[PDB]
Design an enzyme around this catalytic site. Structure first.
Site, PDB file in Angstrom:
ATOM      1  N   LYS A   1       0.831  -1.201   0.000  1.00  0.00           N
ATOM      2  CA  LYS A   1       0.000   0.000   0.000  1.00  0.00           C
ATOM      3  C   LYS A   1       0.884   1.279   0.000  1.00  0.00           C
ATOM      4  CE  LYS A   1      -3.989   2.113   2.239  1.00  0.00           C
ATOM      5  NZ  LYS A   1      -5.052   1.895   3.254  1.00  0.00           N
TER       6      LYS A   1
ATOM      7  N   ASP B   1      -7.767   8.926  12.737  1.00  0.00           N
ATOM      8  CA  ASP B   1      -7.355   7.571  12.387  1.00  0.00           C
ATOM      9  C   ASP B   1      -5.933   7.227  12.841  1.00  0.00           C
ATOM     10  OD1 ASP B   1      -6.772   5.092  11.153  1.00  0.00           O
ATOM     11  OD2 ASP B   1      -7.882   5.564   9.320  1.00  0.00           O
TER      12      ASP B   1
ATOM     13  N   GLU C   1     -11.256   6.276   3.055  1.00  0.00           N
ATOM     14  CA  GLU C   1     -11.303   5.665   4.391  1.00  0.00           C
ATOM     15  C   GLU C   1     -12.045   6.563   5.393  1.00  0.00           C
ATOM     16  OE1 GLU C   1      -7.166   4.412   5.053  1.00  0.00           O
ATOM     17  OE2 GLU C   1      -7.383   3.322   3.155  1.00  0.00           O
TER      18      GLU C   1
END
Ligand SMILES: Cc1ccc2ncnc(N)c2c1
Ligand SMILES: [Cl-]
Lengths: 381, 112
Positions: free
Chosen positions: A71, A199, A175
């Site tokens: 990623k 997050d 997200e």
């Protein structure tokens, strides 16, 4: 097998999570090992290809041929500052193929290179198989999440990873948008609402500010630290216990990799305990040179050892508010995503910053993004 | 003479770990027998180095399995009154560690 429903997949840096909306609720699907989250790991051996838990479990055995952090490479050019920095810390090889990064591994005795989207397709194939094993039906349609800061190339490459995995990518969603969808912040009555997504999980720290006006999500600002997570908090506890062993026994365990690993694993567990208890006890027999290490740590001490790191989480929050041209009083909703948001001190610091405002934390923070993606997947079915 | 039912719960987890240790120790014994065989030198010397280095994955898997046993054992908290559990835990850690030192001996004799 008959045709199944659409799924939500949170393709994470360290772990991936798959959910399904059925019977008016989201069910987070457990893997073969019974785990609700799967390591975003792919291992290549002399005989097989291993994905998830099986890949992570053998990393010590096969460090060079075990890929992770795909990623961090997906949709990027080889010469990207991020690719060049991260490379120094990976045990696997990253090669340049005409400006593009590729992971180079030994697989069934042969040198093989894979594009980051080919590695991520392997993780997506596993998530698809996890969903099919649970449902007993074929899974083709999915909603896959990406960070809000991902560019066109990073988003296209994630979509390409889905296509290679045999998935029909219904939509790619942010997200922080997935997390706001999970808490149904887009369904609340009234005018436009400003949402802060905090997050802290999967080895990265992301702060996003969204403006939701008539269910339309607008990314106003993104801020954070790409290399901050629970591992940093564990390192502080490991350092505390190494110093403590030196004070008590006048012995340095730090050059014994097995002793450090036993202590690190014990600290990871102790940290988790301190999110629900005020004290955690550790008993490690014959840790180093036959010495038993029986000790404990209080939540306060853990908070003391990590005081700068915890407080430092408010700097990307203030930066996000500044970039969004917003005062902290203009935030209508605060959402906690990532496993490290379970830390009571982090919650306390953030709530105090927002003058006692209640936090959206009911949904498991490791599963909130896949949860929102599963809701979106059902909506698009 | 104050043996508790709660300690039976602990001793059962330890017994299971002891059995797991026995299975890994059997793999190590097989590896030890194979390492010994190659050391005889009946293999063409130009191929001795590669056969020894082919035992690497198996030795590393053995080491890893013993490390995972230690990490599981480390999750246990046994009060001072659980004398028998503490002695079984201690004995088991020492046994695993002696097996790990044997694994190290194999790693020093392969891929060199
Ligand atoms: C599941 C779980 C429970 C407690 C935690 N405490 C801190 N950081 C985490 N990542 C945690 C995860
Ligand atoms: Cl499940």
């Amino acid at each position: 097998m008959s045709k199944g429903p659409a799924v939500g997949i949170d393709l994470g840096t360290t772990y991936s999570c798959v959910g399904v909306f059925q019977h008016g609720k989201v069910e987070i699907i457990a893997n073969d090992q019974g785990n609700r989250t799967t390591p975003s790991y792919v291992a290549f051996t002399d005989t097989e290809r291993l994905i998830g838990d099986a890949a992570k479990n053998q990393v010590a055995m096969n460090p060079t041929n075990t890929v992770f952090d795909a990623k961090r490479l997906i949709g990027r050019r080889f010469d990207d500052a991020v690719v060049q920095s991260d490379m120094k810390h990976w045990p696997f090889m990253v090669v340049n193929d005409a400006g593009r990064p590729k992971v180079q591994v030994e697989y069934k005795g042969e040198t093989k290179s894979f594009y980051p989207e080919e590695v991520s397709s392997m993780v997506l194939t596993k998530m698809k198989e996890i969903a099919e094993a649970y449902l007993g039906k074929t899974v083709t349609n999915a909603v896959v999440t990406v960070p809000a800061y991902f560019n066109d190339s990073q988003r296209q490459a994630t979509k390409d990873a889905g296509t290679i995995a045999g998935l029909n990518v219904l939509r790619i969603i942010n997200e922080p948008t997935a997390a706001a969808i999970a808490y149904g912040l887009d369904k609340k009555v009234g005018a436009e609402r400003n949402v802060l997504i905090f997050d802290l999980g999967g080895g990265t720290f992301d702060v996003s500010i969204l403006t939701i006006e008539d269910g339309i999500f607008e990314v106003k600002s993104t801020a954070g630290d790409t290399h901050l997570g629970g591992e940093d908090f564990d390192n502080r506890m490991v350092n505390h216990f190494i110093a403590e062993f030196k004070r008590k026994h006048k012995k340095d365990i730090s050059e014994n990799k097995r002793a450090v690993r036993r202590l690190r694993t014990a600290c990871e567990r102790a940290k988790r305990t301190l999110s629900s208890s005020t004290q955690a006890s550790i008993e490690i027999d014959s840790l180093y040179e036959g010495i038993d290490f029986y000790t404990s740590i209080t939540r306060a001490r853990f908070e003391e050892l990590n005081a700068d790191l915890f407080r430092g989480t408010l700097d990307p929050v203030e930066k996000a508010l500044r970039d969004a041209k917003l005062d902290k009083s203009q935030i209508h909703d605060i959402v906690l995503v990532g496993g490290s948001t379970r830390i009571p001190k982090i919650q306390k610091l953030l709530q105090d910053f927002f003058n006692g405002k209640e936090l959206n934390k009911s949904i498991n923070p490791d599963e909130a993004v896949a949860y929102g993606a599963a809701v979106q997947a059902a909506i698009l079915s | 003479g104050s043996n508790s039912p709660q300690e039976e719960v602990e001793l059962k987890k330890l017994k299971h770990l002891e059995k797991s240790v026995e299975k890994i120790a059997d793999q190590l014994e097989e590896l030890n027998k194979e390492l010994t065989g190659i050391q005889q030198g009946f293999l063409p010397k130009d191929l001795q180095a590669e056969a020894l280095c082919k035992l690497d994955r198996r030795v590393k898997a053995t080491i890893e399995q013993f490390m995972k046993i230690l990490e599981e054992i480390d999750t246990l908290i046994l009060p001072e009154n659980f004398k028998d559990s503490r002695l079984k835990r201690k004995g088991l850690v020492k046994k695993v560690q002696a097996f790990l030192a044997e694994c190290d001996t194999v790693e020093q004799n392969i891929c060199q």
